[PDB]
Amino acid sequence: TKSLAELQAEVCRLDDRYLLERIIGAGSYGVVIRARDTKSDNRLVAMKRVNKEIFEEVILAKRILREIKLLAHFNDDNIIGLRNILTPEDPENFDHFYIVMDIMETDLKQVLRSGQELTEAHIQFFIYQALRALHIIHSAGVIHRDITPANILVNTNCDLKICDFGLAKEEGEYMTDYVTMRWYRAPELVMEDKDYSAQIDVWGIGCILGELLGSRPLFQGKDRVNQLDKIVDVIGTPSEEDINSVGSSAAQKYLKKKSHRPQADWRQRYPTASPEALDLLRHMLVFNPKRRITVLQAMRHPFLEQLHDDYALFRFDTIVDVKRAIYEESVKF
Ligand SMILES: Nc1ncnc2c1ncn2[C@@H]1O[C@H](COP(=O)(O)OP(=O)(O)NP(=O)(O)O)[C@@H](O)[C@H]1O
Ligand SMILES: [Mg+2]
């Protein structure tokens, strides 16, 4: 549960294949471990542990089941792959299980935190790979809903893979305020629009693009209303017709009483950035999702012209019932 040796003994009781080396990721409901597969010629592999707290709530367990299903559903180079599903043979012992994925060197949150220099060529390849991945996910009728730098895995080859389908949605729910990271939520989410689209993932890419171009997270809200303030302070006060197009009645009312903020100068925010980069960034971060750039349009944008090259529908359907479904996904290996 905690020490590496304790985790190793736990994994060995599931499958003797995997040798643990070091913990590379920490989550709210489990840790991520760098392991080597002794039967696959000691190749490096990532292992994602799911702890007991997931199987205490039905909602949480249904989320993890969908995540495994989605990982197995996709077979693409820009989406993190699924290698195995380790589950306890005894239902009386099933209070945890492991998700085995391909290994990536690091992720973007990290990369940005190191303050490492990134060229426009680096950003172009990152952004296109992320968009191309989103196009595949969206074509399968799935919305990622959690597009953040931490959920974007990268190598020194600048190869990119999207991970964490833990909050993925069908292409209308009540968003929670009890969150640790709300800085990448689209304005339609922030303003409590019950029904949203795949454009919320585009917003996340824009936020990521804003940071890749040389910046800390653009919209650092401490709460929901404050998140809206941080967004509007930057992109500027939207037109009356756009305000009426997104948000609940109360959210629209608050936004109208707010003082006028002009569209901030992207050129001043990024003195070195190309006009193509600043336009894609501007269009990705449009208030109204209906006027916001789409994934297809973003892939065809002049900023990615040297990279652009001219999927099946995912079917959505107690805690014990979820556990049984997870082992069924394990049998497939
Ligand atoms: N295949 C992988 N290779 C390398 N690092 C990884 C890999 N998968 C995950 N990580 C790291 O582990 C972190 C957390 O993994 P993640 O899949 O995002 O679970 P999570 O953040 O807890 N969301 P949840 O689905 O609710 O568990 C990521 O931010 C990465 O830094
Ligand atoms: Mg994550």
Structure-token match 């303030």, residue found: 229
Positive or negative: CA dihedral 16, 20, 23, 24: negative
Domain, as residue range, for 252:
104-317
Experiment type: X-ray
User: How many C-alpha atoms does 55 have within 13 Å on its Cβ side?
Assistant: 19
Residue with tokens 């003082």: 259
Return the ligand number nearest the Cα of 31.
1
Same domain, 81 and 134: no
* Ligand 1: nearest atom to the Cα of 104: 3
Any atom of ligand 1 within 6 Å of the Cβ of 81: no
Q: Answer yes or no: do 96 and 238 share one domain.
A: no
Is-contact 289 197, C-beta < 8 A? yes
Q: Is 146 a catalytic residue?
A: yes
CA 67 to ligand 1: nearest atom: 25
- With residue 299 as reference, give the H or E element that holds it: helix 295-299
Domain shared by 156 and 305, yes or no: yes
List of E strands, the chain: 18-27, 30-37, 43-50, 82-86, 97-102, 106-107, 142-143, 152-154, 160-162, 169-170
CB atoms near residue 98 (< 10 Å): 23
Number of domains in the chain: 2
Please, which residues have CB within 8 angstroms of residue 288's CB and are 6 or more apart in sequence? 238, 242, 245, 246
Sign of CA dihedral 237, 239, 242, 246: positive
CA distances from 223 to 188, 205, 257 (A): 15, 21, 19
Q: Does residue 80 have its Cβ closer than 6 Å to ligand 1?
A: yes
Catalytic-role residue among 146, 193, 201, 229: 146
Residue appearing with tokens 């009890």? 178
* Strands laid side by side in the 18-27 sheet: 18-27, 30-37, 43-50, 97-102, 82-86
Q: Quote the strand ranges of 12-151, DSSP E.
A: 18-27, 30-37, 43-50, 82-86, 97-102, 106-107, 142-143
Q: 115 and 99 in one domain?
A: no
Asked whether residue 122 falls in the same domain as residue 267, the answer is: yes
Regarding whether 265 and 118 lie in a shared domain, the answer is yes
Instruction: For residue 146, give the ligand nearest its CA.
Output: 2
Q: Are residues 25 and 123 in the same domain?
A: no
Q: In the block, which residue shows the tokens 């003994």?
A: 9
CA atoms within 13 A of residue 150's CA, in its CB half-sphere: 14
**Pair 95, 134 in one domain:** no
Q: Is residue 104 lining ligand 1, measured as CB closer than 6 Å?
A: yes
How far away, in angstroms, is 164 Cα from ligand 2 center?
A: 5
Q: Are residues 269 and 329 in the same domain?
A: no
Q: 8 and 123 in one domain?
A: no
Tell whether 72 and 151 lie within a shared domain: no
Residues 55, 46 contacting (CB under 8 angstroms): no
CB 86 within 8 A of CB 14: yes
Identify the CATH number of the domain in which residue 291 sits. Answer: 1.10.510.10
Which domain CATH number covers 64?
Answer: 3.30.200.20
Q: Do 237 and 294 belong together in one domain?
A: yes
Task: Name the nearest CA neighbour of 313 among 65, 59, 69, 60.
Answer: 69
In this structure, how many other beta carbons lie within 10 angstroms of the beta carbon of residue 268? Answer: 7
∠ Cα 63 64 69 (to 5°): 100
